[PDB]
Amino acid sequence: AARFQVQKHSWDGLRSIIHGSRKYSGLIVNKAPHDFQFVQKTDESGPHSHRLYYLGMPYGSRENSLLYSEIPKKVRKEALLLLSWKQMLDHFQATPHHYSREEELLRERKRLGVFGITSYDFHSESGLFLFQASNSLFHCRDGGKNGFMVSPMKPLEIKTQCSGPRMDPKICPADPAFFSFINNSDLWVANIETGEERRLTFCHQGLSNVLDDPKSAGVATFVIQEEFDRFTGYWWCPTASWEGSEGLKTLRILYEEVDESEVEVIHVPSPALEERKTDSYRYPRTGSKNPKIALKLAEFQTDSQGKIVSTQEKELVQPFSSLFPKVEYIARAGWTRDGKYAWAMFLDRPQQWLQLVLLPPALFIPSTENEEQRLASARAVPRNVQPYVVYEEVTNVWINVHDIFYPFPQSEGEDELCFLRANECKTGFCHLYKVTAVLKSQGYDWSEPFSPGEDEFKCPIKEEIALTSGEWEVLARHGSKIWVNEETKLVYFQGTKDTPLEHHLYVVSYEAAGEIVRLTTPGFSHSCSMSQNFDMFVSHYSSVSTPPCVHVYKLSGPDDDPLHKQPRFWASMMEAASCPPDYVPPEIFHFHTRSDVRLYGMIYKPHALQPGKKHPTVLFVYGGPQVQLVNNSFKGIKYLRLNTLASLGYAVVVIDGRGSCQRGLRFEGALKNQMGQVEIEDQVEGLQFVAEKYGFIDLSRVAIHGWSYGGFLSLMGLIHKPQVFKVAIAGAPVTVWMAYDTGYTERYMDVPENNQHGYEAGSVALHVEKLPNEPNRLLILHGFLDENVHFFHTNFLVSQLIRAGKPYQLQIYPNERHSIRCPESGEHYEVTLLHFLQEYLHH
């Protein structure tokens, strides 16, 4: 019956509430160990079965370092073993003073907040570790022949004569004496033992005008990093070969060569604000030119002493653009484990057609200006050498790039490739298939200019067995992977089989496809890392009510029944923090829309709730593709401010409407070509359901708040439902889809020329006449340095608001990119949110 009134605090009152909420949280940000490597110990006398390597922030450190824990052979059943974190590196400052533009932008794109060592490459046979640290390259050795340290060793720096940063370092799998890196947009190798360095590619001239120097080798460009989650542009061949009678060893690297010549240039302000300068970006806006791309092959020869004797740039016998004319993007690439084939995952520009293509090294010839030498090379390419399209995925929705492709070893003289593949477009749910392609030879004259027909290189599919099926998903994106045991014929995977609210670890046979066994405990969402010996796994898991823990599990039982190996709790890497007394978990619910679609939501109930009270409500919204807000995992680290709102007496509602992920392609596909037009309808149905079910929602006092897609929908809510939403707080909103990039926008909306109606309807800056004529209903927030949702979106929205004579409030975070990382900015944002709601969320 009655309306609850939030206590109005002074600004300094709100500062103390926010500072207190964070400072006395009873939770620490990014404390979990990660990037796990299991190594077996081979001392029968010793007490430890394994050493476990990982990245983590040890006790009395402010930065990530390389750590190990000892896994004992036996544990007391009636006792909880907390593994001690041992340092690998002796008192070593990995972080630079107070990063370069290259390292800074990479941390923004990989969503990395923590300081210090953020990744390492590891070679198990040799026990070599390789990593970036102190704006240089370092390495150390542990296990293998050398044996296991019992105290922190000092990491050996790798000296260079190169100018500028050495990026994306990787150990050569065939010979760990060698590693690769990118320097000034070109691929280099070095011998880590001898210290010899050698440039392999010569794309980057190093010209004074950078915009006249538009080619790179081995580099993932802006859209590939930001929209396709690929951070490398080169891949070591896993094997050596032995061509020529001189006894030389050949090592190979597949790399993407890019030319950004025709790609539009935008300027984004640089983080040194006092310098009043911008950085230049090759930013493909929707409908404009993406980079020109090709796959190429770098080869070098080595003697028995490890000297680099010769190097060669090799390219496809006919141009990439001739062989693969419909390919806009290379999503992924790699090699078969025998090095027999390079492979690439190719996408068309509409992102409705994917090909998995094998490329034999024999299809690549030496790069040359000499047309006669090139023709001699092309004449020598055998007729039986060709690309093989071993898999093709087609959809009328869009291809989500799935990272799961596992090719099995071939027999000698076998013209088939068996592989595991995650495929969503077949059933509309991402599932594991065992595929057998026949490598069909047509015979090709590579000396003639090439024009591929329909189904050029297309391999017959002899067999395609569903290992999984149903209205749930195998997780195949954004870090999710499979692990394959070829001894037991088992594939381990993560999925939503038990519930869309929880990630679980599962195992199924790929030989006798049948029973799926769950390996993780229901009531938690799990993120797992499996030992390459399939004897142990780590689970990073949480629930809405329980902060995250990291536990080590032993897979135990008879070796003759590997599918039914039992997960046994073994030891803890990190115990769950106490759920704070001031923190009240949200409650997950579900409802059916008027169209009988099931939606999940969660509610943060006003704290110390009294009956007969209607409370002012904040609808917290993301609502975009590739994200699920509502699941059974701990929200108090990333979304503490929602608990803070509930503590002051706001109800907080979160709805996963149509367009959100982990519900299949059809569910996500509801927003195709009509972003903005359907998401608000589901949000309002959720709000009305929560009001009817729970009874404490004041529908006369609803705020809408979100960031990025959530900022976009906050403005759309005020435009389409001005009687529902009293106020909107729009953080980093997309306001004009024509200003957003190719990779994201075209996937969901097509190009502007093909979807004028959708682009117009979905661009909030073109509908400012429908925004409120009353002041204090709209707050816009934006990081000045945002390289994803450019400040331009807010600038253009403001320009339109002025033209339409509409009021607005604005806050800028001058030192922030897309997400607020600095504590002062984060606190100021939260204080501003509390102040805006207390002053302006009224009936």
Ligand X SMILES: *C(=O)C(CC)(CC)C(=O)Nc1cccc(CN2CCN(Cc3cccc4cccnc34)CC2)c1
Question: Which residues does the annotation place in the binding site for Val-boroPro?
Answer: 708
Residue 620 beta carbon to ligand X: minimum distance, rounded to whole angstroms: 13
- The backbone torsions φ and ψ at residue 101, rounded to the nearest 5 degrees and listed phi first, read -55, -40
Q: Can residue 7 be called a binding residue for its own copies (CB under 8 A)?
A: no
Q: Can residue 76 be called a binding residue for its own copies (CB under 8 A)?
A: no
Ordered DSSP codes for 375-412? HHHHHHS-TT---EEEEEEE-SS-------EEEPPPPT
Residue 479 beta carbon to ligand X: minimum distance, rounded to whole angstroms: 5
The question of whether 818 is a catalytic residue gets the answer yes
572 to 601: interface string for its own copies, x by CB under 8 A: ------------------------------
In total, the chain counts a number of residues equal to: 843
Comparing CB distances to ligand X, the nearer of 434 and 818 is 818
Spatial separation of the C-alpha atoms in residues 329 and 353, rounded to whole Å = 11
The residue number whose beta carbon is nearest to ligand X equals 708
Question: 508 - beta bridge partners?
Answer: 491
Residue 773 beta carbon to ligand X: minimum distance, rounded to whole angstroms: 28
Residue 274 beta carbon to its own copies: minimum distance, rounded to whole angstroms: 7
User: Contact at 8 Å (CB) between 295 and 255?
Assistant: yes
User: Contact at 8 Å (CB) between 315 and 296?
Assistant: yes
Residue 82 contact among its own copies, ligand X, none, beta carbon within 5 to 8 Å by kind: none
Q: Residue 350 is which amino acid? A: P
Residue 788 contact among its own copies, ligand X, none, beta carbon within 5 to 8 Å by kind: ligand X
Residue list 222-281, contact with its own copies (CB under 8 A): 265-269, 273-278
194 to 213: interface string for its own copies, x by CB under 8 A: -------------xxx--x-
Comparing CB distances to ligand X, the nearer of 554 and 818 is 818
The question of whether 786 is a catalytic residue gets the answer yes
Residue 241 beta carbon to ligand X: minimum distance, rounded to whole angstroms: 38
Residue 645 beta carbon to its own copies: minimum distance, rounded to whole angstroms: 19
Q: Can residue 832 be called a binding residue for its own copies (CB under 8 A)?
A: yes
With CA atoms as reference, report the closest residue to 731 among 806, 638, 819.
819
User: Which structure tokens are listed for 642?
Assistant: 């929602």
Residue 798 contact among its own copies, ligand X, none, beta carbon within 5 to 8 Å by kind: its own copies
Sign of the four-CA dihedral 711, 716, 722, 724 = negative
User: Contact at 8 Å (CB) between 618 and 703?
Assistant: yes
Among residues 402, 767, 793, 818, which one is catalytic? 818
Among residues 21, 708, 714, 819, which one is catalytic? 708
Q: Which residue positions form the known binding site?
A: 708
User: Which structure tokens are listed for 770?
Assistant: 């429908």
Contacts with 23 (C-beta within 8 Å, 6 or more apart), sequence order = none
Residue 10 contact among its own copies, ligand X, none, beta carbon within 5 to 8 Å by kind: its own copies
Comparing CB distances to its own copies, the nearer of 190 and 729 is 729
8 to 37: interface string for its own copies, x by CB under 8 A: --xxx--x----------------------
Comparing CB distances to its own copies, the nearer of 532 and 773 is 773
Residue 415 contact among ligand X, its own copies, none, beta carbon within 5 to 8 Å by kind: none
User: Which structure tokens are listed for 192?
Assistant: 């880590």
User: Contact at 8 Å (CB) between 192 and 177?
Assistant: yes
H/E stretch holding 159 reads none
Comparing CB distances to its own copies, the nearer of 28 and 810 is 810
Comparing CB distances to its own copies, the nearer of 266 and 378 is 266
- The backbone torsions φ and ψ at residue 796, rounded to the nearest 5 degrees and listed phi first, read -70, -45
- The backbone torsions φ and ψ at residue 177, rounded to the nearest 5 degrees and listed phi first, read -60, -30
Residue 111 contact among ligand X, its own copies, none, beta carbon within 5 to 8 Å by kind: ligand X
User: Which structure tokens are listed for 546?
Assistant: 């329980």
Question: 810 - beta bridge partners?
Answer: 780
755 to 774: interface string for its own copies, x by CB under 8 A: ------------------xx
H/E stretch holding 584 reads none
732 to 751: interface string for its own copies, x by CB under 8 A: -------x------------
Residue 19 beta carbon to its own copies: minimum distance, rounded to whole angstroms: 9
Residue list 338-377, contact with its own copies (CB under 8 A): none
User: Contact at 8 Å (CB) between 671 and 625?
Assistant: yes
Radius of gyration of the chain (CA): 28
Q: Tokens 């108090």, residue?
A: 636
Residue 366 beta carbon to ligand X: minimum distance, rounded to whole angstroms: 39
With CA atoms as reference, report the closest residue to 707 among 794, 777, 769.
794
Helical ranges in 174-221 per DSSP H: none
H/E stretch holding 301 reads strand 292-302
β-strand 329-335 against 342-347: which pairing, if any? antiparallel
Spatial separation of the C-alpha atoms in residues 621 and 102, rounded to whole Å = 32
Residue 277 contact among its own copies, ligand X, none, beta carbon within 5 to 8 Å by kind: its own copies
Comparing CB distances to its own copies, the nearer of 713 and 785 is 785
Spatial separation of the C-alpha atoms in residues 342 and 333, rounded to whole Å = 7
Q: Summarize as ranges the residues that interact with ligand X (CB under 6 A).
A: 111, 227, 478-479, 624, 626-627, 708-709, 734, 788-789, 818
Q: Can residue 775 be called a binding residue for its own copies (CB under 8 A)?
A: yes
Residue 708 contact among its own copies, ligand X, none, beta carbon within 5 to 8 Å by kind: ligand X
Q: Tokens 């149903």, residue?
A: 470
With contacts defined by CB under 8 A, name the span among 409-417, 515-523, 640-648, 827-835 that binds its own copies: 827-835
Comparing CB distances to its own copies, the nearer of 634 and 813 is 813
Residue 627 contact among ligand X, its own copies, none, beta carbon within 5 to 8 Å by kind: ligand X
Residue 818 contact among its own copies, ligand X, none, beta carbon within 5 to 8 Å by kind: ligand X
Comparing CB distances to its own copies, the nearer of 311 and 815 is 815
Quick one: DSSP state of residue 765? G
Spatial separation of the C-alpha atoms in residues 227 and 295, rounded to whole Å = 20
Q: Tokens 């076998």, residue?
A: 414
Residue list 806-825, contact with its own copies (CB under 8 A): 807, 809-815, 822, 824-825
Instruction: Determine how many CB atoms are found less than 10 A away from the CB of residue 119.
Output: 17
148 to 187: interface string for its own copies, x by CB under 8 A: ----------------------------------------
Size of the site for its own copies (CB under 8 A): 51
β-strand 613-620 against 697-707: which pairing, if any? parallel
Spatial separation of the C-alpha atoms in residues 465 and 512, rounded to whole Å = 10
Residue 723 beta carbon to its own copies: minimum distance, rounded to whole angstroms: 18
Spatial separation of the C-alpha atoms in residues 684 and 725, rounded to whole Å = 10
Q: Residue 83 is which amino acid? A: L
Task: From residue 604, give the alpha-carbon distance in Å to each of 26, 640, 658.
Answer: 19, 11, 22
Residue 795 contact among ligand X, its own copies, none, beta carbon within 5 to 8 Å by kind: its own copies
Among residues 786, 790, 793, 835, which one is catalytic? 786
Quick one: DSSP state of residue 740? S
Largest separation between any pair of C-alpha atoms in the chain: 92
Q: Can residue 784 be called a binding residue for its own copies (CB under 8 A)?
A: yes
Query: Which residues are designated catalytic?
Result: 708, 786, 818
Residue ranges in contact with its own copies by CB under 8 A: 10-12, 15, 207-209, 212, 265-269, 273-278, 283, 739, 773-775, 784, 790, 792, 795-796, 798-799, 802-803, 805, 807, 809-815, 822, 824-825, 827-828, 831-832, 835, 839
